[PDB]
Structures are given as C-alpha cells and as structure tokens.
Design a protein around this ligand. Structure first.
Ligand SMILES: Cc1cccnc1O
Length: 119
C-alpha cells in the first residue's frame, strides 16, 4: 500500500527502455532537419528523455500521467509513418508491447494503494 512506490518503479522501467535497441529513434526529440514536415502532422512532440526529465523534476503526480506521455510517443510514430511496414514504426510497436507488459502492475499497485488510503 505504498502511495509513492510508483516513482522508483517508473525510473527502473525507463532504464530498461533506454537499454533496448528499439528505443534509439525515441530517446531524443525528432530532428526537424532530417524530417522537415514533422510539425505539419504532429501537434505535440514527445520523447523518452523528456519523460525521464519530467519524472526526475517532480512534475508527475501519478503513474497515469507518465503513461499518457509514453503512449503519445507511440501514437506520434503511428501518425507520422508512411507505411505500417516502416522500420521506425515497427520498432515502436515492439517497444509499446514491452512498456504495456511492465506498466500494468505499476498502475494496479498505485490505484490499490490510493483506495486503501481513502478507505
Ligand atoms: C516515429 C518517428 C518516425 C519517423 C522518424 N522519427 C520518428 O521518431
């Protein structure tokens, strides 16, 4: 029932994501010089360095906020891809499966701890 445990759990999961080769396109903001029409398609950029920095600054209140920004990484990749077969999009789908498999217990434990707190 530890209401604060989610934060270290999210730090450890971001460390695994940075070790995965599939994360490399998503570690830093998309390069607008490589992709000059990016902002004509994507309204809100997001990357794993920004997520990590927001967490370490104390600017997430809950793991649900962090999950919403990680899901935006994946939805931007799906919106920007020219093909469902593209290399970078294909990397996003494997990394999304790994994230969703690991975040499920973080969310469940946090929401259980808050219910116990308000009992
Ligand atoms: C998702 C994405 C697609 C194309 C280029 N870079 C990215 O990060």
């Amino acid at each position: 029932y530890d209401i604060q445990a989610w934060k270290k759990q999210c730090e450890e999961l971001l460390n695994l994501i940075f070790q995965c080769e599939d994360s490399e396109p998503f570690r830093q903001p998309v390069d607008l010089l490589e992709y000059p029409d990016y902002r004509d398609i994507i309204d809100t950029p997001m990357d794993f360095a920004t997520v990590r920095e927001t967490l370490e600054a104390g600017n997430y209140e809950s793991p649900m906020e962090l999950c919403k920004d990680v899901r935006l990484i994946f939805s931007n990749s799906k919106a920007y891809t020219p093909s469902k077969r593209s290399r970078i999009y294909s990397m996003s789908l494997r990394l999304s499966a790994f994230f969703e498999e690991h975040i499920s217990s973080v969310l469940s434990d946090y929401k259980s701890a808050l219910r116990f707190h308000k009992r």
